Structures are given as structure tokens and as C-alpha cells.
Amino acid sequence: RIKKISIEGNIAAGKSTFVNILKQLCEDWEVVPEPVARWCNVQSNGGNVLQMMYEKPERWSFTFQTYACLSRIRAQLASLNGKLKDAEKPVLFFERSVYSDRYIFASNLYESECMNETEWTIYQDWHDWMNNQFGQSLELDGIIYLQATPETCLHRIYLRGRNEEQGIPLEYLEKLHYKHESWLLHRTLKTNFDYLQEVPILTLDVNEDFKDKYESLVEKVKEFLSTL
């Protein structure tokens, strides 16, 4: 019933920041953040699976990438049955979609030789199935790509904090950048969900600050949503 918009971007590009600005511009506009919280502390002071992947990827890239996508579905599906469900002109913004999970990060980790054939086969198999049961209602109506040079992102990773991502090199962000570009800009990166084929994509340059110029961006978004 609700219009579902996904906010794609690189690491520390600024989805959270950008969405919070939209969040407070309507009571019929909710958000569904990546559960990065539970990734740094597993539960049911446990363990930090995010950090484990970073410290030794060739070992935890699979474990993580799986838990990560599961955790996201659980979260998106929930906010889907929330109070918002009964409003008039509702819109739900997702911080990333299960698509970038698999086609951007997971994929890139496999190409970076952190997941062997067997692991990467299982992952796709698992993912393919999961998004055929529940995923039937998480289909997107639109996508907003916050474009930003990997250098700008590497900077915002520092400005942010998280003592896990501090070891991340430009190379990694760069590889992840091209992945985004290929998928949302040049639209050459092929999926496995033939519907993304006809899905609208607003791209915004977010290399310059937000808390200031954020006026212009919003205008373009209101515009975009008005055509769905």
C-alpha cells in the first residue's frame, strides 16, 4: 500500500544524514535504517561481526554478508506493518536495499577473493530464495542514488567515527563506487530481478555539504516523488 523508496549510496555518502532531513517534512514519511547497530553487537555485549569481517574478511565475509541481509529484511518488513501503514500519502525510505547487499558489497567481496565458489554460490542461492517469499512486498517504487567521490566518502568515514571502518583504504571505496555507478548510473550492471528494469532513479551530487545547501536537493526529491 505504501510507496517504497530506496536510498543508495557509498559508505558514509550520507543517506542517514540526507533522509533525516526528509523525515522531518511529513508525518507520512518514515525511515528504515540499516541495522548497523545489531551488526556491532549481535544479540537475540556479545560480539562485533562487522569488525570481524574487516579484521579477517576471507573468513567472515560470508557469515557477515548473510546476517546483514537477513537483518535488513527483518527490519524493512517490520516498518512495513507499522502505524504508517494506515496514513494517506505514505512513503517509506530504506537505507540501502537487499539489491546493493548482494550486487554491490557481497559481489565485490567475492571478486576480491574473500568468498570462495561454494560460499558465493550458497549466498546467491539463499538470497534468490529469500527475496521470492517476503521480498514480494518490498519491491521498490523508486531509488535515490546519493553520488559522491570515494575520496569524499573516505573523508566522511573519518568525520563519522566508527573505529571499525578506520582501516578502510581508498581502493575499497573506489571498487564499491564503480559498482554503484555501473548499476544506478550506466544501468549496465545486470541483476536477477527483471523489474528493477523499469524503476525510476534520481541521482544527486552530494559532494558539497548538506546542513546548508540541503534546500535544492529536497526540491528535486519532492519533484521526483510527484511522478510515481
Next chain:
Amino acid sequence: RIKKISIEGNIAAGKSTFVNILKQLCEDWEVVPEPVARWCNVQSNGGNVLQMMYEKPERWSFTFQTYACLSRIRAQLASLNGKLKDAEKPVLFFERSVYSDRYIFASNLYESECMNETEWTIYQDWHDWMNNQFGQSLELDGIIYLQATPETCLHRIYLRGRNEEQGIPLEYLEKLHYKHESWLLHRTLKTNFDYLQEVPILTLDVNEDFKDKYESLVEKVKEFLSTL
């Protein structure tokens, strides 16, 4: 609409063997085998995740145990919508249930220090969730425990073949045996599904051959089912 019966046993105890005897005793009696096929070949030529777990458990016990339970649900759920669905007095026999997956094998692998805290937490968390969505229709109506000394099993593991299980020692089978005993016989092994509490359990000694004495056993089963 179908009565679901689970056939629990140790490794190579003889479920497959025993069920095939029942399978051919009614057209309203189908079977759902462990997809051990796809576990030895993930591509469907590819990698053998079963063997990987055996060669280096402290590394693949998690990956395997997860795929294994997923694969089972996918299979049980399917046969659940098969032609059998519209018969008169239908019965579907499961080779193992997701319960022994988690409380017998996975559990025991964690206690054997092959899954660290973080892995075992995620597994339970994952499993707890999975069996709350679909699992709602895979609830058992009865269970049949094929009891057999671990030694007898170790023997049948040899008689069978599988060049993966040939490295298995008695200790392993023994540990797995007590697990079974504690859960289905002494019923002291506590779960997390408060309904198994009131579920019927027929135990049969299968230490002596089947292709012969298999008459007696069947009698006791027809008997058991008649009271459900």
C-alpha cells in the same frame, strides 16, 4: 491438512531404509528425504560443503549447519504443496526435523568448540526466526525415533559408503547418541518450541536387520498412527 511425522535417528541408523518400506504401503504416504544430495554438490559439478565441514569443522560447521537447515525447510515446505495435499488420509514422513538440526547436530558442534559464541548466537537467532514464519505449518503430529547403538551406526556408515563420513569416529556418534536419547527418550533436553511438549513419540529398536524382521516394526507404526 496433512499429518506430518518426523523420523529421527542417528547417522546411518536407517530412516531412509525404514521409510521406503512404509512408502510402499499406501499412495497417501509420501517422503521428504534430507537433501544430502545438494550438500555434496552445491552447484547442481561444484563444491562439497558436507566434506568441507568434516575436513575442517572449526571453519565450516557454521556455513554448513545453516545451509543444511535452510535446504531442509525449502524441501519440506515443497512436498507440503504437492499432489499428496488433496488425498484422503495423507501422511508425510520427514527424514529428520529442523529440531534435531539445531538441538542435536549444531548444538553438539558448538559444545565441541567448532562454533564460537558469535556463530552459535547467530545460528540460534536465525533458526528461531525462520521457524516462526513458515515453520508455522511444519509443526509435527508425531515422531518416530529409530534407536540404535552408536556402534551399530558406525557399522552402517561403513556398509553405506559416502567417502565423507568414513573419517567419523565412535566418539562423535556417541555424543550424538546421548543427544538423541536425552531429547526423545528421557525427554529432559529442553527446546524452545513449547509444543513439542505434547507430541507423541514411538521408539523402535533397529539394531537388528530390517529387510527381514521389518514386519513387526510396521505393525507398531500402523498402531501409532491410528492414535493421532
